[PDB]
Structures are given as structure tokens and as C-alpha cells.
Design a binder for this molecule. Structure first.
Ligand code: HEM
Ligand code: HEM
Ligand code: HNI
Ligand code: HNI
Lengths: 146, 141, 141, 146
């Protein structure tokens, strides 16, 4: 996980334009629609029965805000993602029993959401930088599993 | 696709396993939980202690499903249909984990079939386990 | 399996891509080479830099293959038969790379289809690209 | 990267009993048989037309020995696999054009080969330690790719 200077500023510039609450609800919702087995962790969230039921689900949206909020906070620590996400890694392993493949899938959905939102501004070099970020974040969240 | 030669190899190798299947199923689970600890995220409700009777019971179920698939190697989509439903809709195990159990089953077979685990048989078994995995993830979305 | 709704969604989305299919193919390749540099190992003979004429030309080929798969969405194993043979036997591209290009294709479509790339349509496109990838890796062994 | 003292001793103890010639030939040969697309790097090795041809091929055997010799040397650097494999990483990327997925496949075949040879002695804990090693080695060989 090594971003270049121009990649680091590209990530930061793009993220300044991101509504984190919105993008988080959208990314979590898309995860549950595109990969519906990921719904398995969210029985308590209520109606997940159709794409609209998932996307507009108020609990899905609320959870997406907290998930992407933690992601966003992590972007200030790109040289220490393992440290940054250690307690969350431990939590998702020991308490929540979330297979870390879910972090990888969410990363890829998030990349799709950024592309959808930003259009041509989400250039191949900007994508490449975000692919490093999302892989690094998923690896960090996976790192304390045991 | 499993070739007629694959099917020959699989049937003979599983024939040799015979009544050890149940034991080997449990061993492959134990191997999976130790080697690939993320797989334990699907079993937080299990007793994973050493010699766990729950794990042993489960290994037998896994093995019995494999024995059935071998017996119905020409029509695995139908043989494994209810099991496919169960994984897709109830268990919702990420597809990525099937390769991990498949590898652990292969390792288990290798450790118990000194004579029979030739390069060609190894290839066929790997294909067979991937084919089982394919059927079991066919209804996920 | 692609559902009726999936095929409606894929046909409608690829319909909107329209004459841009070749451009988007090339864009997806560039995205793949930049984001997943291990995929470059299959193209050591290519110019892989931005604006590459080889990449532009190859993007058209990939796009045309996808257009053909869409036209034959209910018989992809046959429509893509020759291409599957080519990847399995002549190119021998590791199967893991197909998910990398599929993701890059999805990202490219997302970047060009603001109204069209809904969550339902995203899901259908992902399933479609996974199915094409499955066909293309079906003859490897 | 985090091999524990107990894992380390498990790895080293088993390895002291390994015939690197046999195991190397068997692992590379099985790689080419079980995942035949990996033969793409080896057209110069001559006859790879059947499993028997692959296994008995002098060039496959020699290369298998060489590869596993470098793997074996790597076991002296368990806490810095990335450092020790950095040169070979660049080589396999830039000179050899080898997709790093090949390293992962070879690792899993090597595990099968060790189980085949050692039988019951290749216990679940010994396997799990070796899984950490082959993952670490594959990751180290992939690390300098660009
Ligand atoms: C070769 C592939 C597999 C086979 C043949 C297989 C077979 C089975 C069988 C026969 C059952 C019992 C079904 C019943 O009670 O009706 C089962 C249940 C289950 N399997 Fe799978 N399985 C496979 C892969 C996996 C993988 C890779 C995982 C996760 C790592 C997994 C997780 C589970 C879980 C969590 C249950 C339910 C356990 C319980 O609470 O009773 N399976 N499987
Ligand atoms: C959606 C998935 C894919 C589609 C639809 C596709 C389609 C095609 C097509 C139409 C061709 C030209 C065939 C011909 O010359 O007749 C081709 C060639 C080729 N593809 Fe694939 N492909 C896909 C995935 C991949 C991936 C993932 C890789 C490696 C990362 C790859 C590597 C290659 C290579 C190396 C060639 C030969 C290029 C040359 O030297 O001329 N393909 N592909
Ligand atoms: C699909 C599964 C899944 C994914 C992909 C995911 C991905 C992520 C990512 C990835 C970028 C981050 C930073 C992250 C952060 C968080 N998750 Ni995750 N989580 C997941 C399933 C959960 C679950 C389940 C909870 C608890 C929800 C609840 O019901 O309270 C959770 C709770 C959290 C919490 C709150 C912790 C607490 O309750 O103390 C944070 C923060 N997370 N999760
Ligand atoms: C399937 C392909 C493949 C895999 C999995 C693989 C896996 C590995 C692993 C994994 C544990 C190690 C440590 C390793 C070590 C080596 N490889 Ni790899 N190599 C591979 C394809 C090659 C090729 C191709 C060469 C050149 C062969 C030749 O003889 O020309 C090679 C050359 C080498 C050399 C010789 C370098 C030199 O010229 O000085 C070493 C050492 N390696 N290779």
C-alpha cells in the first residue's frame, strides 16, 4: 500500500467533494443489492426485499454513514492503515463475525459509486489511486482476524 | 466440465476413502478453521474446541454431501439442489470460502491417499471440488 | 443465471453505450492496466501508456465481443466458444484476471451512464460480466 | 508476516526433513498438470504433453529444484520476506512477465505435495503454519510488481 504524492493529492482533492453521509449510504446499499448474501449481517435492519427497499432503508443509510465516516477518517492516515483500523478489525472479527471479503466487495462498490457520482472526473489515474486506498483499507480491516 | 476421465478418477479415489469420508470431512474443517481463520466467521455459533463433537458431526454432513455428488457425478446440479438453495439463501457464505474448503479437502485427501493421489488424480479431484463449489454458489444472486 | 430483468437491464444499458462501446472498451483496459498492474504481464508486447493505439484497437475487439454476448445472451457458451478457446489455450490468462477487467468495465459504465447505472442495473451488469468471464474460463482444464 | 515463535519452529522442523529436489520437482510438475495454463512460461522446457511427460521432464525437475531452493533460502528471512524476495519480485515482473497469481497457485500445490509426502505428520497446525509461509512468500514475490 504505497500512494505516490500526486495520487495522495488526487485522493484528497476528490474526497473534499464527497458527501460522506450520502456516499456511505449509497455504497452500503449497493453492496447489499449487488451482492445480496451481504444482507446476512443486517437481519435487524428490516425490509431488504427489493433494490428500493434496500437503498432507501433508513437503517441501511444510517449504517452507511458510520461505515464511510470511519473510512473517511482513515484517509488522514494512509501510511498507517493497519494501526488506524486495528480496533475495528478486532471488533468485526470477534464481535460481529464479518468475513473480511465483505470489506473487499465494499471497496469495489465504493469505487463504482465514486465513478457514478463524478463521471469523467473519476479518471483512470484517480481510480488507480482509489484502488490502492480501498485495498489498503480492506487489508487493514482484515489484519487482526484470527 | 468434468471429463469422463475425471469422473473415473474421482469415483476411484472416493471409493478408496470409503467409510473414512466422515472423518476426512471433519479433518478438512479443522484444517480450514486453522489455516484460514476467516472461515470461522461462519461458525461463531459452533463449539470449535479440539475434538469438537459439533465439528465432527458437521464434517460427516459435508462428507455425505460429497459422497452423494460423486454418486451423481453426471447430474450434480440436481443432486446438490437443496444444498445449493441452503447456501445461497440461508447461510449466505461468501463464494470466496468455497475454494478454501476445497483446498483443505484436497490436502486431507493427499495426506490419506499416498498411492492414489497421483498428479492426474489431484487434477481431477481439484476440478471435482471446484465443480461442487460452482453448483453450491449457482443461486446466490 | 441471468434473470429476465437482468437481460432487460443489460440490453438497455449496452443499448445506451451504443456507438461508444469501442471507446469504453479501451477506457476499461486502460483503467485495468493502471489499477491492477499485474494484468500488464499478459501484454508485454503492447504499448500500455495513455493514448496507446494498441490499447484503443484492443478495446474495440473487447467491446465487439461484449456486443456479441449481449446479442446472444441466452447462448453465451456457444457465441463465445472461439474466444473461450483462445483464452484457455493460446493466451492462457489466469482466470483471476477476468474479475479485474469486469470491475474496470463496470466502473467505466458507471462513469458514462449517470441515469442508467441504477443499483438494479449495476447488479445485472455485474452478473452479466461474471457470466461472460465464466464462459471465457470454462475450457481451461 | 506475523509468524509466532511456535509457528516458526513448526516450519523449520518440518523443513529439515524435506527433500527439496523431490518436493520442488513435484510441486512445479503438479502446478503445470493441475493448472495447465501455467505451462505458458515453459514452452522452452520441451515435452509437457501428458502428466507423465511433465513430471519426468528434466527441465521441469531442474526448475522445480531451483525455485524451491530460493523458497528454502527465504525461510531464513521469515520476518523480512519482502526484503529478501525484492530482487526476484522485480525479475518476475519486468523480465519474466509472470502474473503473481502463479506464486499463490504454486504455494497451494506445495502444501498438497507436503501433505502427500508427510501424511499424518502434516498435521492441521503444521499446515496452518505453512499456509502463512506460502502466503507470505507469494505476497513478497508480488510486492514489487508495477
Ligand atoms: C465443498 C463445499 C461444501 C459442502 C459440500 C458443504 C456441505 C454442507 C452440508 C451438507 C451442510 C448441512 C446442511 C443441512 O443441515 O441440511 C452444510 C451446512 C453449513 N455450511 Fe456448507 N458446505 C460446503 C462449503 C461451505 C463453506 C466454504 C462454508 C463456510 C466457510 C460453509 C458453511 C456452512 C455453514 C455455516 C452451515 C450451517 C452449519 C449449522 O449451523 O448447522 N459451507 N454445508
Ligand atoms: C470481459 C472479459 C474479456 C473479453 C470480452 C475479452 C475479449 C478478447 C478479444 C475479443 C480478444 C481478441 C481475440 C482475437 O484476436 O481474435 C482478446 C485478446 C486478448 N485478451 Fe482477452 N478478453 C477479456 C478478458 C481478458 C483478460 C482479463 C486478460 C488479461 C488481463 C485478457 C488478455 C488478452 C490478451 C493478452 C489477448 C491477445 C492480445 C494480442 O496479443 O493480440 N483478456 N480478448
Ligand atoms: C457487509 C458487512 C460489513 C461491511 C462491508 C463493513 C465494512 C466496514 C468498513 C469498511 C470500509 C468500515 C470502516 C466499517 C466500520 C464500522 N462498522 Ni462495519 N461492516 C460490515 C458489517 C458491520 C456490522 C454488522 C456492524 C454492526 C451493525 C449493528 O447492527 O450495529 C458494523 C459496525 C461498524 C462500526 C460501528 C462499530 C460498533 O458498533 O462499535 C463501524 C465504525 N459493521 N465497517
Ligand atoms: C509458473 C511460473 C512461475 C512460478 C510459480 C515461479 C515461482 C517462483 C518462486 C515461488 C516460491 C520462487 C522463489 C521463484 C524463484 C525463481 N524463479 Ni520463478 N516462477 C515462475 C516462473 C519463472 C520463470 C519463467 C523463470 C525463468 C526460467 C528459465 O529457466 O529461464 C523463473 C526464474 C526463477 C529463478 C531464477 C532467477 C535467475 O535467473 O537468477 C528463481 C530463483 N521463474 N520462482
Amino acid at each position: 500500500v504505497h500512494l505516490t504524492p500526486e495520487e495522495k493529492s488526487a485522493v484528497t482533492a476528490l474526497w473534499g467533494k464527497v458527501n460522506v453521509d450520502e456516499v456511505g449510504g449509497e455504497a452500503l446499499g449497493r453492496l447489499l443489492v449487488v451482492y445480496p448474501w451481504t444482507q446476512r449481517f443486517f437481519e435487524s435492519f428490516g425490509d431488504l426485499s427489493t433494490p428500493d427497499a434496500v437503498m432507501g432503508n433508513p437503517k441501511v443509510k444510517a449504517h452507511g454513514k458510520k461505515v464511510l465516516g470511519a473510512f473517511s477518517d482513515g484517509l488522514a492516515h494512509l501510511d498507517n492503515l493497519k494501526g488506524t483500523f486495528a480496533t475495528l478489525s478486532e471488533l468485526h472479527c470477534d464481535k460481529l463475525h464479518v468475513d473480511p471479503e465483505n470489506f473487499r466487495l465494499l471497496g469495489n462498490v465504493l469505487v463504482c459509486v465514486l465513478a457514478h457520482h463524478f463521471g469523467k472526473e473519476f479518471t483512470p489515474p484517480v481510480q488507480a489511486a482509489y484502488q490502492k486506498v480501498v485495498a489498503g483499507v480492506a487489508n487493514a480491516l482484515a489484519h487482526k482476524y484470527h | 466440465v468434468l471429463s469422463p476421465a475425471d469422473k473415473t478418477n474421482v469415483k476411484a479415489a472416493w471409493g478408496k476413502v470409503g467409510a473414512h469420508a466422515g472423518e476426512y470431512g471433519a479433518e478438512a474443517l479443522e484444517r480450514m478453521f486453522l489455516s484460514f481463520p476467516t472461515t470461522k466467521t461462519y461458525f461463531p455459533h459452533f463449539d470449535l474446541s479440539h475434538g469438537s463433537a459439533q465439528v465432527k458431526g458437521h464434517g460427516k454432513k459435508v462428507a455425505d454431501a460429497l459422497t452423494n455428488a460423486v454418486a451423481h457425478v453426471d447430474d450434480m446440479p440436481n443432486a446438490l439442489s437443496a444444498l445449493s438453495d441452503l447456501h445461497a439463501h440461508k447461510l449466505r457464505v461468501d463464494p470466496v470460502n468455497f475454494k478454501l474448503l476445497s483446498h483443505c479437502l484436497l490436502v486431507t485427501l493427499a495426506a490419506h491417499l499416498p498411492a492414489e493421489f497421483t498428479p492426474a488424480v489431484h487434477a481431477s479431484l481439484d476440478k471435482f471440488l471446484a465443480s461442487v463449489s460452482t453448483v453450491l454458489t449457482s443461486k446466490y444472486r
